[model samples]
Target: GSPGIGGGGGGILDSMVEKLGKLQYSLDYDFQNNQLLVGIIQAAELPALDMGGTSDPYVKVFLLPDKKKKFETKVHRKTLNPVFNEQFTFKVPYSELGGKTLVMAVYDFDRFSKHDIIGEFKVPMNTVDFGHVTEEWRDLQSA
Candidate 1:
């Protein structure tokens, strides 16, 4: 588990990936703007991805199966706890969003090699109350 704004974020991700960390985020539907706004904020307790110790971490988000529209946050270097009040938006219509899946991936960036995925989580749009701002704490699942 990682410690940040909420103090901790943990679950199965903690058990499966010893080196994996956690991310805290929120989502809001802006009816006025006709958009789905996503927040990828605090990351906690991330394990070091580099042999030198510590990691450069960031987040990737997309709505699948239409992953053609994707967004990413800036990399926060060398820290388990990184604050990224980064926000992303999708131009999704409310009538068409229910069957979509919101996918979030936490990654450790590496210059010499492919970026390593710490973990990921998927939120089914059907389960959300998109008319309101909803912030949830969920465990990251393995890719």
Candidate 2:
């Protein structure tokens, strides 16, 4: 048996479960006459943000060009999985939205100690087309 894992091979099931998509979200923008920017970070199968405990996880959203205002989700308690279903809209001009950096982070919320980040992914905001909203599933690494 491994040092940490048990001899019953129970964690094998846990590893397989991780095979499911860890990150998923959607993007939207306006076309035709309306030029608006919007994004919906629907959910995440947040892995244990802690060493051996349910992670108090929260989501933080950020966009480049203006890093002053940061968007965030309410912290969920003692969970490896939580549904944020949060939506954010940027009033910035559509042109500025493209080529801008979009970033999302999953972190373990700690009131007394420093928060720990589980994993993060960043990309150019225009990776998805502007017109209709598109939902995309991503692994730990992607565009």
Candidate 3:
């Protein structure tokens, strides 16, 4: 007994799936110790998931080919945009880094229920420039 979304036109549910936001971060490689450093700088324009129109957000980083090791940033409560400014290290040879991809996922930390994933993006290691400092902001997409 209710009218459907968009009436009989296009986009019944598709119009609702707008982009969530964007993520800003940096990466560096320490050649001497074969370490890959990931810096979580901040995120902007994140989607609200809580009752008060904000999200308790955190980030998870993984270097893949394998996920035996991973890292996560501290949660920022009641915020749509958060500055993490946290760094994590991964032990991987420079040679093997090209075979891997970096997976960064933003998630909403929930106290009483399952944590919700906000968005995610992937960076192929082979495409990165190891010289100088590698920093970039990428658009976040629903996974």
Candidate 4:
């Protein structure tokens, strides 16, 4: 049987949705201070969410089940890869980490309309190795 539409068309058709991106971040827990620290290191290969092939990108983080406390990183202008190097602290007891999850969302900062979500990463806090600083780069996934 012949390939009706041809295999070459697959390449162009898959180009509609660009790669979301990756995020470099770290998580640490302090027993002495009774705090959980999150560090936003950087992001790479983010899709251009706006005109001229660039996006104003920022990161928002939340400790789930407690939406009242959320943190956001500074927005970087017209960049596909942004280095944030910003850290946030949460007043969380180490014993309660099992009940918490971290939500890291990347958004395109829009001055006029509502900000658009580029992608996000979710991590179950209890799954992490908090004996030392846990730092890694994770690929962003769609909503």
RMSD, one per candidate, in order: 9.3, 7.0, 4.4, 4.3
Judged by whole-model lDDT over C-alpha atoms, candidate 4 comes out at 0.89
Could you tell me which 10 consecutive residues in candidate 3 have the lowest summed lDDT? 4-13
**How close is every model to the real structure, measured as TM-score?**
0.81, 0.71, 0.84, 0.85
lDDT by candidate, in order shown = 0.82, 0.66, 0.88, 0.89
What is the per-residue lDDT of model 1 for residues 38-140, given as tens digits with 9 covering 90 to 100?
A: 9988888776545758878888999989949478899988887889899999998888888899998988888899998888889898898866688865566
Clash list (residue pairs), candidate 3: none
By TM-score, how accurate is candidate 3? 0.84
**Candidate 2 lowest-lDDT run of ten:** 33-42
Compose the digit string of candidate 3's lDDT tens values, residues 50-105: 45579899999998878585789999998989999999998888988878999999
Ranking by lDDT: 4, 3, 1, 2
In model 3, state the lDDT of residue 127: 90
TM-score pick, better of 2 and 4: 4
- The better candidate by lDDT, 2 or 4, is 4
lDDT of 2 by residue, 34-119 (tens): 44443535445665433666778787777776667778888888877677777776666777676788777777799999887776
Quick one: RMSD of model 3?
Answer: 4.4
- List the candidate 4 regions with Cα displacement exceeding 4 Å: 1-18
